[PDB]
Amino acid sequence: SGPPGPPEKPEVSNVTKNTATVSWKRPVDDGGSEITGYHVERREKKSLRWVRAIKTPVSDLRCKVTGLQEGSTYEFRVSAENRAGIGPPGEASDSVLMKDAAY
Ligand SMILES: [Cl-]
Ligand SMILES: [Zn+2]
């Protein structure tokens, strides 16, 4: 019994100039113990480094990400943790451009 497997590809919705909703599913493989939290990371389009997109892990399967730069393009990925620790990150979401909707 070890850490969870990867979550699936997240969905991004409700995009504004500086916020978005990111949602995902529970990993199929929990490693043998209950999932206690999820890390959400973000990467600006064609940049290399993944960075924390939320201050601390969430337990629900979605979150409102804030602090995104207007005019930038981002993708997001999720990692799950249990008592044994964090599992590998899942694949990146589709990219979204941060802009206030017209209307
Ligand atoms: Cl699920
Ligand atoms: Zn953690």
Residue numbers in the entry: 3 to 105
Question: What text comes from the article?
Answer:
Titin is a protein expressed in the skeletal and cardiac, or striated, muscle of vertebrates that plays various roles in muscle structure and function. Encoded by the gene TTN, titin spans half a sarcomere (the basic contractile unit of muscle) and has various functions including preventing sarcomere over-extension (Gautel and Djinović-Carugo, 2016), acting as a molecular ruler for thick filament formation and as a hub for numerous signalling molecules (Kruger and Linke, 2011, Linke and Hamdani, 2014). Fn3 domains are only found in the A-band region of titin, where they are arranged with Ig domains in a pattern termed super-repeats, which themselves are repeated. Fn3 domains have a characteristic beta sandwich fold, with a core of hydrophobic residues as the “filling” between two beta sheets that pack against each other face-to-face.
Here, we present the crystal structures of seven human WT titin domains – Fn3-3, Fn3-11, Fn3-20, Fn3-49, Fn3-56, Fn3-85 and Fn3-90 – and two domains harbouring rare missense variants found in patients with HCM: Fn3-3 Arg15908His and Fn3-56 Ser23226Gly. In addition to the WT domains, the structures of Fn3-3 Arg15908His and Fn3-56 Ser23226Gly were determined to a resolution of 2.10 and 1.43 Å, respectively. The two rare missense variants have each been identified in 12 patients of an 874-patient HCM cohort at UCLH, with general population minor allele frequencies (MAFs) of 6.5 × 10-3 and 7.2 × 10-3 for Arg15908His and Ser23226Gly, respectively, suggesting they may play a role in the patients’ disease. There is usually a positively charged residue at the Arg15908 domain position, and the Ser23226 position is also highly conserved. The two variant domains, which each harbour a rare missense variant found in a cohort of HCM patients, closely align with their respective WT domains, with the mutated residue incorporated into the domain without affecting its conformation. Both the Arg15908His variant in Fn3-3, and Ser23226Gly variant in Fn3-56, however, result in the loss of polar contacts, and this is reflected in the loss of thermal stability of the domains. The high melting temperatures for two of the variant domains (66.9 °C for Fn3-3 Arg15908His and 53.4 °C for Fn3-56 Ser23226Gly) suggest that for these it is the former, as previously characterized variants linked to disease via domain instability typically reduce the domain melting temperature to below physiological levels.
